[PDB]
């Protein structure tokens, strides 16, 4: 759905080591099978392939889709002008079996809504519209908030896309907070826990899972979205959660009715050794402490932890080659209490409530 990025984008991905999956410019929709569109698409495909085929970060071309465009036109351009890259014609509660029991080794799209920071709210909204609740009635969005969902045309309606924020908050935390700062923290926490869980679930189920591409990292307009950072650089709380489960070597915990499975995942070609400690946040009790060996490019199990009672948080501290790393795990089942989760996050000592 975006333009093709310029050369400087790929030069940056080249030197930072970020592989690039490039979809051709077609969006959610089927397209013409006639000769005029094919010629225009062929002229476009050859131009962008010749422009980009020499970047080492570029690894895949996709049709983002019997179709002439995806199975004939675009595949014929890759066949002649870039045979060294593959071509692919086509692409609630976060612990619900729809997400958990998804049998795909490689997830290409996955996202949860997250209310932007207060500073970004006050900048894009009129002063009397910064608070989302029209007439104070919790759940009913004012017109400016309905615009930034995003409403493509100026039709006055209630509900729609923005209800995803209150629905996901109502699930995890039982009730939607009326106070704006509480609603910001609640909505960002739901996005943070949901996104962190998907990455820990995919990294924790290796070698069956082969990859995860989440949606998305940055907004291209002042908007209310499922991105983890805004157009003005405002990082939502999910950005910090996601950052701590994207390390080259990551100690994480996956759920089990038996309790907690402390694992360590390695996305390198080297073996690493460290020491990991897990303690309960509300009680301060140490649940586990010991060294580990993380084999290269594989997931290694460390230990199985005893099941704690009720709801709470475990803080994961591990040191690898003189560097301290931090992670956490929220145990129990929703609904959670918002004020209790906030204390656990502040005492975990990793993320600031801001």
């Amino acid at each position: 759905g975006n333009v093709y990025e310029d050369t400087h984008f790929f030069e940056l991905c080249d030197k930072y080591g970020i592989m690039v999956w490039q979809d051709f410019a077609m969006g959610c929709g089927n397209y013409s099978q006639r000769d005029n569109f094919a010629a225009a698409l062929e002229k476009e495909a050859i131009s962008v392939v010749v422009k980009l085929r020499n970047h080492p970060s570029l690894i895949l071309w996709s049709g983002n889709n019997n179709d002439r465009v995806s199975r004939q036109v675009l595949s014929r351009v890759i066949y002649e002008f870039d045979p060294t890259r593959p071509y692919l014609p086509s692409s609630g509660y976060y612990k619900d079996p729809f997400y958990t029991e998804n049998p795909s080794q490689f997830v290409s799209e996955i996202g949860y809504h997250g209310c932007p920071n207060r500073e970004t709210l006050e900048r894009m909204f009129s002063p009397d519209s910064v608070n989302p609740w029209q007439n104070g009635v919790v759940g009913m969005w004012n017109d400016e908030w309905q615009t930034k969902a995003n409403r493509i045309y100026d039709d006055k309606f209630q509900g729609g896309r923005n209800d995803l924020m209150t629905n996901q908050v109502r699930i995890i935390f039982g009730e939607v907070p009326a106070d704006l700062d509480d609603f910001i923290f609640a909505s960002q926490s739901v996005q943070a826990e949901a996104m962190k869980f998907f990455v820990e679930l995919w990294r924790g189920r290796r070698p069956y899972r082969t990859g995860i591409i989440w949606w998305n990292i940055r907004d291209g307009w002042p908007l209310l979205s499922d991105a983890i950072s805004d157009y003005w650089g405002g990082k939502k709380q999910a950005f910090y959660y996601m950052q701590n489960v994207h390390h080259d070597v990551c100690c994480l915990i996956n759920p089990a009715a038996n309790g907690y499975m402390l694992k360590v995942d390695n996305n390198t070609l080297k073996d690493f050794e460290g020491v990991v400690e897990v303690k309960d946040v509300a009680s301060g009790k140490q649940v586990f402490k010991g060294k580990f060996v993380s084999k290269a490019n594989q997931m290694s199990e460390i230990a199985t932890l005893p099941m704690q009672k009720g709801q709470g948080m475990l803080v994961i501290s591990y040191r690898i080659e003189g560097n301290e790393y931090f992670n956490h795990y929220l145990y129990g089942e929703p609904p959670y209490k918002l004020d209790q989760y906030r204390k656990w996050v502040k005492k975990c000592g990793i993320y600031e409530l801001e």
């Binding site: 002649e80 002008f81 870039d82 045979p83």
Partner: protein, 368 residues
């Protein structure tokens, strides 16, 4: 009748500039050298006759023809146009133009050739004059034509030259391990003038439907396409004749009520065509004529020798050729260019085919 435009032409050659010469005033204005050329021919044959180049077959003289790959070649001659009756068509036939060229008749363009390997026919009925007419062909550089294209990745680095990928010429002319690099140029096959009646044969496609060699029977089909003015519908008959050494075997006449027809000939007392060893190469003269039913005037006639034979490739489930229901064992050679200057090919064909007859090859593969 068919009037031959072969013989002595005028050849003017000069280096091709940044803007290739496409017109006549440009070809006459260009500073070049003029020589007497023989058509059919190659331009290097004409230059060697003029003492301008040395024999490329000896020593390293093949590399001395290198600069002429960037030259243009201006052919020009004068012919007498025959008097055409109302309704007839005057066709200018080129058997071989190497390669990229503009064809003019009386200062008017009649076509643009772009393929060395196929014939080029032009209708010049409306552009000819009375008496002497001027024919001009301005050929440009085949090598420089490649730079008008952007090559795909797998078109670069092959054994065939990158100059050969986007153009329709013989790939070995650019150089091979068994053929020299001698791109050359010129009218390397016959150039003739043809006068066609309003009623003429466009194509006569002979096809063997079935063959019973032991019964000496065969079923031949004739897919005939003609030019037929509507006032000539129901007034022309097609005369089909199958003969051997003069003896007539079958004669079928049918009224032409439409321009295209299929005539099926169920023949008896005819021998099947076989490859060497497996039997005789029995050939029969097949002649089709378009005859007026009233005046008896013959408007056109096509004649060729056809063979009654079936061919099936059995892919083993690594293949075997099946000729007339029999599995033949193929033994033969690959057929490569007879000459780097391909206008001399026709002078080698008879003697080179005899090499395969003496070898007793039953098959030959014409190399791409």
């Amino acid at each position: 009748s068919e009037q031959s435009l072969n013989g002595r032409w005028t050849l003017k050659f000069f280096p091709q500039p940044a803007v290739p010469v496409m017109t006549i005033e440009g070809a006459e204005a260009a500073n070049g050298i003029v020589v007497d050329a023989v058509v059919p021919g190659n331009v290097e044959i004409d230059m060697e006759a003029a003492g301008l180049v040395e024999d490329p077959m000896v020593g390293n003289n093949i590399y001395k023809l290198r600069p002429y790959e960037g030259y243009q070649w201006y052919y020009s001659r004068t012919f007498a146009a025959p008097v055409v009756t109302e309704g007839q068509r005057l066709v200018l036939h080129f058997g071989g133009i190497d390669t990229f060229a503009e064809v003019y008749v009386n200062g008017i363009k009649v076509g643009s050739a772009d393929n060395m390997l196929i014939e080029h026919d032009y209708d010049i009925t409306s552009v000819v004059k009375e008496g002497e007419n001027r024919l001009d062909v301005i050929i440009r550089s085949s090598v420089m034509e490649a730079q008008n294209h952007f090559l795909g990745t797998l078109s670069i680095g092959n054994f065939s030259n990158e100059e050969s990928a986007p153009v329709r010429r013989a790939p070995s002319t650019y150089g091979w391990d068994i053929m020299p690099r001698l791109v050359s140029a010129g009218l390397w096959r016959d150039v003739t003038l043809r006068v066609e009646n309003p009623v003429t044969i466009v194509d006569a496609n002979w096809v063997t439907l079935s063959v019973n060699p032991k019964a000496r029977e065969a079923s031949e089909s004739l897919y005939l396409q003609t030019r037929l003015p509507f006032e000539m519908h129901d007034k022309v008959k097609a005369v089909i004749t199958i003969s051997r050494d003069g003896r007539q075997i079958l004669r079928k006449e049918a009224l032409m009520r439409k321009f295209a027809n299929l005539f099926t000939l169920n023949l008896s007392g005819v021998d099947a065509w076989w490859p060497r060893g497996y039997g005789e190469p029995a050939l029969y003269t097949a002649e089709v004529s378009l005859v007026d039913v009233t005046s008896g005037k013959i408007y056109d006639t096509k004649t060729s020798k056809i063979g009654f034979r079936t061919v099936k490739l059995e892919l083993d489930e690594q293949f075997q050729f099946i000729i007339n229901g029999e599995p033949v064992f193929a033994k033969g050679t690959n057929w490569v260019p007879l000459d780097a200057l391909h206008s001399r090919d026709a002078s080698h064909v008879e003697e080179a085919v005899q090499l395969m007859v003496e070898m007793n090859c039953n098959i030959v593969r014409c190399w791409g």
